[model samples]
Target: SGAIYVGNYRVVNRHLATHNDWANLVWEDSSRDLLVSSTTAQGCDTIARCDCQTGVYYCSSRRKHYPVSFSKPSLIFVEASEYYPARYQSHLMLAVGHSEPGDCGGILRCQHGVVGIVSTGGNGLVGFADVRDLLWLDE
Candidate 1:
């Protein structure tokens, strides 16, 4: 068990939040020999909670898990043949039949020999969209 005395340090900066959803604070201890660097993360109270509990329970790894997805395309779909084809601006769709819990069954292969699947998520159905490839996808 650990305890923090906020009175022991003076905060020097309360910086603005960054796009990655974290900000930092600068502080120095009473002795002034030790500098404190604190992290401010958005989207959950567990961050602050677990920091208090310490090892009492698992805490979030403090990562977004998925990078910022900036492209919400107005996709272009066409039929190059009897089979339906899709695209995002000029590239092939990484996955088809956008994820929705209502129904899902998509397993298509692109020229890269990679496979794509429409996966379900708590948020609903989600699919693999790429650029450099999908931010969640590693290579």
Candidate 2:
């Protein structure tokens, strides 16, 4: 277990009931300080902070795990294709072809290759939807 704190860390999530999702992890240049943590809750709980003019993080590591997603409120998706046109977009559909109990699979991959599968509690079938490509993929 680890913990850090900051100010003006913008916490964004739907105003309705939803799973606790980690939207983004933000840090500032020069300061190398976190303005917002990756998984802040929707309110001022243990996982709460402020907001600011957010930038972006260019990671040298491959896209292994993403910090944000939704299994409800609407199907989850990523939008990096618009931000980074150079990246390729692939369909990562979950719970497709009608739903059945424990009838789904979610895998995690990096720039190099497939990493592993996400461990959800049950038939919920969930994992990180890397926004490294298209947001609303037409699959």
Consecutive 10-residue window with the lowest summed lDDT within model 2: 48-57
Alpha-carbon deviation at 60 in model 2, angstroms: 25
Q: TM-score, each model? A: 0.18, 0.19
Q: Give candidate 1 regions above 4 Å deviation.
A: 1-97, 121-125, 128-139
Angstrom error at residue 10, model 2: 18
Among residues 3 or more apart in sequence or in different chains, the pairs in candidate 2 whose N, CA or C atoms overlap within 3 Å are: 8-50, 8-51, 9-50, 9-51, 10-50, 10-51, 78-135, 79-135
**Alpha carbon lDDT of each predicted model:** 0.23, 0.25
List model 2 lDDT by residue over 42-101, tens digit each. Answer: 322222111211212111122332332223211333333222323322222232112222
RMSD in Å for all candidates:
19.6, 16.4
lDDT per residue as tens, model 1, 47-118: 121111011111122211222122232243322322122322222222222333322222222323222222
Top lDDT prediction, candidate number: 2
